[PDB]
Design an enzyme around this catalytic site. Structure first.
Site, PDB file in Angstrom:
ATOM      1  N   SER A 173      35.096   7.601  23.653  1.00 44.76           N
ATOM      2  CA  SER A 173      36.464   7.991  23.772  1.00 44.76           C
ATOM      3  C   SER A 173      37.733   7.744  25.271  1.00 44.76           C
ATOM      4  O   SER A 173      37.726   8.951  25.831  1.00 44.76           O
ATOM      5  CB  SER A 173      36.525   9.349  23.729  1.00 44.76           C
ATOM      6  N   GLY A 174      37.115   6.348  25.912  1.00 46.08           N
ATOM      7  CA  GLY A 174      37.829   6.627  26.330  1.00 46.08           C
ATOM      8  C   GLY A 174      38.842   4.819  26.019  1.00 46.08           C
ATOM      9  O   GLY A 174      39.508   4.326  26.704  1.00 46.08           O
ATOM     10  N   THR A 178      40.802   7.711  18.940  1.00 40.82           N
ATOM     11  CA  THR A 178      41.361   8.806  17.621  1.00 40.82           C
ATOM     12  C   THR A 178      42.861   8.909  17.273  1.00 40.82           C
ATOM     13  O   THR A 178      43.081   8.580  16.085  1.00 40.82           O
ATOM     14  CB  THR A 178      41.531  10.596  18.307  1.00 40.82           C
ATOM     15  N   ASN A 219      32.709  11.244  31.341  1.00 40.95           N
ATOM     16  CA  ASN A 219      33.616  11.701  30.161  1.00 40.95           C
ATOM     17  C   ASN A 219      33.975  13.366  30.392  1.00 40.95           C
ATOM     18  O   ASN A 219      33.313  14.085  29.572  1.00 40.95           O
ATOM     19  CB  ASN A 219      33.407  11.430  28.956  1.00 40.95           C
ATOM     20  N   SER A 222      34.347  14.676  25.467  1.00 45.39           N
ATOM     21  CA  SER A 222      32.795  13.488  24.416  1.00 45.39           C
ATOM     22  C   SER A 222      32.641  14.944  23.170  1.00 45.39           C
ATOM     23  O   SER A 222      31.880  15.431  23.274  1.00 45.39           O
ATOM     24  CB  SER A 222      32.183  13.326  25.190  1.00 45.39           C
ATOM     25  N   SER A 223      33.091  14.178  21.922  1.00 45.31           N
ATOM     26  CA  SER A 223      32.850  14.731  20.868  1.00 45.31           C
ATOM     27  C   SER A 223      30.887  14.723  20.915  1.00 45.31           C
ATOM     28  O   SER A 223      30.502  13.621  20.037  1.00 45.31           O
ATOM     29  CB  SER A 223      33.351  13.851  19.505  1.00 45.31           C
ATOM     30  N   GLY A 445      28.623   6.438  19.255  1.00 40.56           N
ATOM     31  CA  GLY A 445      27.533   5.325  18.689  1.00 40.56           C
ATOM     32  C   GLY A 445      26.756   5.077  20.193  1.00 40.56           C
ATOM     33  O   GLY A 445      26.818   5.800  20.953  1.00 40.56           O
ATOM     34  N   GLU A 447      23.335   4.508  23.245  1.00 39.44           N
ATOM     35  CA  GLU A 447      23.618   4.855  24.350  1.00 39.44           C
ATOM     36  C   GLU A 447      22.166   4.270  25.355  1.00 39.44           C
ATOM     37  O   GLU A 447      21.114   4.572  24.611  1.00 39.44           O
ATOM     38  CB  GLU A 447      23.783   6.424  24.719  1.00 39.44           C
TER      39      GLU A 447
END
Ligand SMILES: [Ca+2]
Ligand SMILES: [Mg+2]
Lengths: 798, 155, 135
Positions: A173-174, A178, A219, A222-223, A445, A447
């Site tokens: 999410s960088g 979304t 982050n 982060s979801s 995803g 890691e």
């Protein structure tokens, strides 16, 4: 070429304007740059498994190995659209074409099936009804790389072909994954009625975006859960509405905040003076650094100021469909957790059984739940069992309980989440008619970290499983193109290699099972577990290794390495049998079941197992679902770590593209016969390689060329419509073209030089006899005028 | 690769004649050993000739017939182009795909690619074959490619 | 065959019906200071002995043996002057004579262009081929 595609394809000019390079194919190749990951080069002299080399922009003479040396795609395939079409297919080559299109505003590309996209950091025209109007209906190969393509093509799928469609989108999410998602539906609508749903869901955002999204070390937001926004469709491609689902959300962030990571955002907005009117009722103070289940390290964040939302959220509530009555239960309930970790006790001295001190907070939460403050400790301190006939109170070691609570802190939340969903699953349950759907799953995803543990091993496992799914897909998708071309032998299924690693996790006597086992025995020692897994694996499995060489900075030494598609990951099974225990005290359930508040009722309304155990299944629930939906993909990528447009820390993409599956899909691609070609566009492009054997058809002209050329059967396979060659083949073909033309021209040039001269020849033969006559007599004359005698005659002429 | 006595006889006259232009003495400047063959019948290339003695500049080394004949061997074999060989290459610029190519494109091919000719030279041949650039500045690379091939003395 | 018997009488001074090494400088000096003995004698070295008329026009005819007409020669030039300009550029004809064909030696050169029509850098050959052919 219109101003619309202005940001889609590069003006045909720079195609005809490419100049500098000639692709001395033999030399110019990519090299491992420690500053740019892979920079352009050219060679000079090869010794052995070593090579002396200089760079392009630079002129640095490096000494590289014959392995680290990567091949370069020829000028031809540049800023190329679908990258599964390059002749050479590696990282650098991939890396580049992405940096190349990026270094030219372009931010969409097709890597085989995967559609890649990079955050621009600068909103651009790119999305418009006009553009939407163009793609609207156009198949993949018709217009440039663009997210809109995936959609309609997904649309086309669900409607035309029957079943359901899915479009897996991912990317830290960088990468703003979304917004891309927004688009997918905007388009999933501005074309589903043209024979809002969009906006509606964007408000609920800051709701779930103050829950399942927290500041995890890497982050600010982060979801920490996986959403599958299913968008159903009726008998006649009619948007029935919008529904959601919440996949494996980590409850763990609740009781164990690390040093730089604290819980979820909510307590940080709740304890923040967003509303002094609601600031007390739960029984808490304004400081965000004094809450045992929060003060492990972090508090407030930079651009976050953590206020307004607690106010705006308040609004998103009313908005939908649920009075402040239940809305209230929320605020408060959320507090229960807070104090819950703030509860204290003690056992006896050299004895095993706890007792209290914090009956006030016990009283606090309890009433904030409609339970006798004395009710809790009864079923909580030294609880009550429920064997076959008569419930025996179970002595309570500080152990079982201390965790039992960490269980309540969470267990509640999880539901308090699954419920919250079902609600928003209601608001939009504005049902019309339902038959199918085109869900859009997004899961954190893969890691790979500086220190890997249990939480990691899992997300990957998920992913490890997920990526498989794809392989298989691209397998069957291939299995037809081949048979749709007649040209078809075969290779086993791709998604099989991944089983090895998968079964080394899920299957019985496997990494997971073991842990699922030892979390029962009351002797569970990190080392004890370590021991069994080895005896159970190492020495006889090639996916289960042992902590190799420290690759980057200063690693966090661990117990083993799992061989993941992404690579071999180092997992430190330390404190695993300690984090995974999700026990069930069958009382608190009932106890919390019907206290006094409605929710409190139904939730618990409607052991001592494990997270993984649920993970494992919940996953199935996810996978199984997927195994029945024409898959789609979208891999957004965060160009760089400094929201700075243009910049590109290749390194940060190679790791990303390494965790996308893209690179593996390539590896998968590499094997067979990628680079395919229409005999049509094949002959004209490569007819020059054997001009004299072409009768002067198409599926033939080419037939020959390959033949006269000596094309090795291994290398290719003729279909019926087109021809397939081994990765790197065209590369040769190109290079060949490159010299023949060059020569053929020279021969033609050196056939002009002949002419020009066969021409003058005669004029040249006549001219000899002239220079001779001139040369001859001018001599004669030179003789007479010098003759003393010719002095007498000239002298007198009486 | 075994000149007939006819063929050899012919090699003489040429060589003989080409040595009356550097100065009778039975020596032909390694520089003209390319132009000599052209007169004999072979259309070798600059690479081809540089690799048999051929000097890049005139008056750097002269050759005797006894030294020359040898070199005239190596050149007889040198890959000579063909109508297809050519057409086909001239066809990769004819995007229009109808036998036409920009008048300037051509000029580019002939003196901007491979062994660049000399503008005078491009002119000489363009002028000698009357490749009349038509209307919008276009020529049929076909017929230009058939003329040059049939030499300057027509069948 | 005529310009030898017409100017015959004067070919000698004392007329011994033949020649005389002393009747040589007889009608020689009459015009300009004669030369040194070896020249007067060597000038006789040709016809290996007592010269006669036929043995005179065997030297004075021996020399002009292989010379072409003022048109041949003329024509031999213009093969170079193509735009029918009746002129060779100066350096082009010097190059012809001195590096090609049976080259002229630095001296052969010098003599060749000492008095050669040459205005503005254009060797006028049609006339130079008169300066030659006693035109
Ligand atoms: Ca010479
Ligand atoms: Mg006398």
């Amino acid at each position: 070429n219109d101003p619309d595609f202005q940001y889609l394809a590069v003006d045909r000019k720079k195609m005809m304007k490419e100049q500098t390079a000639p692709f001395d194919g033999k030399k110019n190749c990519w090299v491992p740059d420690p500053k740019e990951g892979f920079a352009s080069a050219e060679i000079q002299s090869s010794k052995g498994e070593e090579i002396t080399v200089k760079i392009v922009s630079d002129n640095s003479t490096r000494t590289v190995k014959k392995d680290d040396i990567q091949q370069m795609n020829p000028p031809k395939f540049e800023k190329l659209e679908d990258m599964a079409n390059m002749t050479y297919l590696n990282e650098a080559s991939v890396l580049n074409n992405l940096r190349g299109r990026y270094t030219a505003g372009l931010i969409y590309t097709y890597s085989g099936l995967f559609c890649i996209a990079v955050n621009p950091y600068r909103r651009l025209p790119i999305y418009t009804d006009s553009v939407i109007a163009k793609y609207r209906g156009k198949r993949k190969t018709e217009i440039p790389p663009h997210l809109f393509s995936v959609a309609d093509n997904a649309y086309q799928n669900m409607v035309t072909d029957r079943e359901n469609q899915s479009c897996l989108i991912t990317g830290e999410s960088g990468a703003g994954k979304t917004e891309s998602t927004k688009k997918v539906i905007m388009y999933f609508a501005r074309v589903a009625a043209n024979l809002n749903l969009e906006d509606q869901i964007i408000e609920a955002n800051p709701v779930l975006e103050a829950f399942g999204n927290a500041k995890t070390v890497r982050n600010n937001n982060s979801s920490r859960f996986g959403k599958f926004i299913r968008i159903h469709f009726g008998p006649t491609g009619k948007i029935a509405g919008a529904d959601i689902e919440t996949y494996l959300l980590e409850k763990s962030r609740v009781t164990y905040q690390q040093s730089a990571e604290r819980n979820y955002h909510i307590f940080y907005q709740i304890c923040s003076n967003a509303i002094p009117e609601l600031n007390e009722v739960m029984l808490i103070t304004p400081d965000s650094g004094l809450y045992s289940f929060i003060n492990q390290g972090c508090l407030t964040v930079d651009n976050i100021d953590d206020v307004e939302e607690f106010k705006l959220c308040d609004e998103a509530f009313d908005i939908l469909g649920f009075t402040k009555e239940e809305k209230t239960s929320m605020f408060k309930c959320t507090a229960s957790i807070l104090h819950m970790g703030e509860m204290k006790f003690k056992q006896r001295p050299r004895e095993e059984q706890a007792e209290s001190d914090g009956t006030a907070e016990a009283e606090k939460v309890a009433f904030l739940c409609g339970i006798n403050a004395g009710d809790l400790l009864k079923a909580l301190l030294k609880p009550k069992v429920k064997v076959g006939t008569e419930m025996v109170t179970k002595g309570q070691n500080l152990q079982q309980v201390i965790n039992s609570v960490g269980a309540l802190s969470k267990s509640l939340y999880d539901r308090m989440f699954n419920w919250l969903v079902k609600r928003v699953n209601r608001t939009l349950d504005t049902k019309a008619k339902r038959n199918y759907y085109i869900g859009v799953l997004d899961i954190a995803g893969f890691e790979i970290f500086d220190f890997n543990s249990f939480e990691q091993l899992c997300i990957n496992y998920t992913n490890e499983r997920l990526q498989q799914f794809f392989n298989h897909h691209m397998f069957v998708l291939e299995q037809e193109e081949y048979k749709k071309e007649g040209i078809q032998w075969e290779f086993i299924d791709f998604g099989m290699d991944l089983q090895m690693c998968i079964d080394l996790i899920e299957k019985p006597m496997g990494i997971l099972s073991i842990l699922e086992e030892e979390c029962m025995f009351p002797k569970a020692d990190d080392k004890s577990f370590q021991d069994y897994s080895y005896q159970n694996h190492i020495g006889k499995n090639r996916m289960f290794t042992k902590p190799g060489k420290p690759t980057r900075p200063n690693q966090g030494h661990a117990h083993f390495e799992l061989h993941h598609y992404a690579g071999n990951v180092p997992y430190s099974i330390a404190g695993w049998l300690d984090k995974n225990k999700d026990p069930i005290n069958e009382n608190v359930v009932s106890l919390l079941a019907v206290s006094k508040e409605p929710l409190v009722a139904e939730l618990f309304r409607a052991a001592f197992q494990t997270i993984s155990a649920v993970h494992r299944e919940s996953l199935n629930k996810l996978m199984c679902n997927l195994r029945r939906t024409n898959p789609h993909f979208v891999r957004c990528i965060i160009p760089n770590l400094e929201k700075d447009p243009g910049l590109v820390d290749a390194e940060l993409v190679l790791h990303q593209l390494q965790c996308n599956g893209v690179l593996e899909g390539i590896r998968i691609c590499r094997k067979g016969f990628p680079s395919r070609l229409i005999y049509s566009e094949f002959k004209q492009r490569y007819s020059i390689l054997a001009p004299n054997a072409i009768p002067q058809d198409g599926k033939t002209v080419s037939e020959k060329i390959l033949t006269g050329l000596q094309m090795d059967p291994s290398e290719y396979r003729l279909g019926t419509t087109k021809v397939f060659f081994k990765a790197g083949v065209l590369g040769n073909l190109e290079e060949m073209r490159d010299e023949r033309l060059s020569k053929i021209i020279s021969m033609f040039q050196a056939h002009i030089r002949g002419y020009l001269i066969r021409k003058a020849y005669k004029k040249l033969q006549d001219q000899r006899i002239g220079l001779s006559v001139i040369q001859r007599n001018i001599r004669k004359w030179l003789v007479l005028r010098n003759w003393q005698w010719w002095k007498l005659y000239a002298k007198v002429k009486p | 690769p075994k000149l007939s006595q006819d063929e050899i006889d012919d090699l003489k006259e040429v060589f003989e004649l080409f040595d009356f232009w550097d100065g009778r003495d039975g020596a032909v400047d390694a520089f003209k050993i390319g132009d000599v063959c052209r007169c004999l019948g072979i259309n070798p290339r600059n690479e081809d000739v540089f690799a048999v003695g051929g000097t890049h500049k005139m008056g750097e080394k002269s050759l005797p017939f006894e030294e020359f004949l040898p070199a005239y061997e190596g050149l007889m074999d040198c890959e000579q182009g063909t109508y297809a060989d050519y057409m086909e290459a001239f066809k990769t610029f004819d995007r229009e795909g109808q036998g036409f190519i920009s008048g300037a494109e051509l000029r580019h091919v002939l003196s901007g690619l491979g062994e660049r000719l000399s503008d005078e030279e491009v002119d000489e041949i363009i002028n000698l074959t009357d490749l009349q650039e038509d209307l919008e500045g276009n020529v049929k690379y076909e017929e230009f490619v058939k003329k040059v091939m049939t030499g300057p003395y027509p069948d | 065959i005529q310009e030898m018997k017409e100017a015959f009488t004067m070919i000698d001074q004392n007329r011994d019906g033949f020649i005389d090494i002393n009747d040589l400088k007889e009608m020689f000096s009459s015009l300009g200071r004669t030369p040194d003995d070896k020249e007067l004698t060597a000038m006789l070295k040709e016809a290996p002995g007592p010269l006669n008329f036929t043995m005179f026009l065997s030297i004075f005819s021996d020399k002009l043996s292989g010379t072409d007409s003022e048109e041949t020669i003329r024509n031999a030039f213009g093969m170079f002057d193509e735009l029918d300009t009746k002129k060779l550029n100066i350096e082009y004809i010097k190059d012809l004579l001195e590096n090609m064909g049976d080259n002229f030696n630095k001296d052969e050169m010098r003599m060749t262009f000492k008095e050669a029509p040459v205005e503005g850098g254009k060797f006028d050959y049609v006339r130079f081929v008169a300066m030659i052919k006693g035109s």
